């Protein structure tokens, strides 16, 4: 949609890079934790995946 | 007495900047609000608008 016209934005790889990285990377590696399960009684914690939210520089 | 050598024309009509008069209804369209893509019909103009 971008850069077919005119020329692109020298900075637009990293930008791209960074917004693909922030949409689904952080999601796609939350899913793959396990189950932390390590006793006789199995205590077991959890992370909902769902309730991801990345909060503005302090 | 002769008039001078380059025979002399007459153009009669409006005096406009930069109209274009020849409007037809074109099939392809561009963005709205970005008139950096709009070059890409100038490209591969609408058949009327070839040579306006």
Redesign the interface.
């Known amino acids: 949609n971008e850069g077919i016209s005119t020329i692109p934005g020298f900075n637009q790889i990293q930008f791209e890079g960074f917004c693909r990285f922030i949409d689904q990377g952080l999601t796609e590696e939350l899913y793959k934790f396990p189950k932390i399960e390590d006793t006789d009684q199995e205590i077991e914690f959890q992370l909902f995946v769902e309730t991801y939210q990345l909060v503005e520089p302090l | 007495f002769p008039y001078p050598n380059p025979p002399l024309v007459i153009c009669f009509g409006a005096a406009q900047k930069e109209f274009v008069p020849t409007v037809r209804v074109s099939h392809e369209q561009m963005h709205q609000d970005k008139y ?2 709009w ?2 019909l100038q490209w591969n103009p609408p058949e009327f608008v070839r040579a306006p």
Request: hydrophobic share 25%; glycine share 0%; proline share 0%.
């Open positions: 950096s893509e070059k890409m």
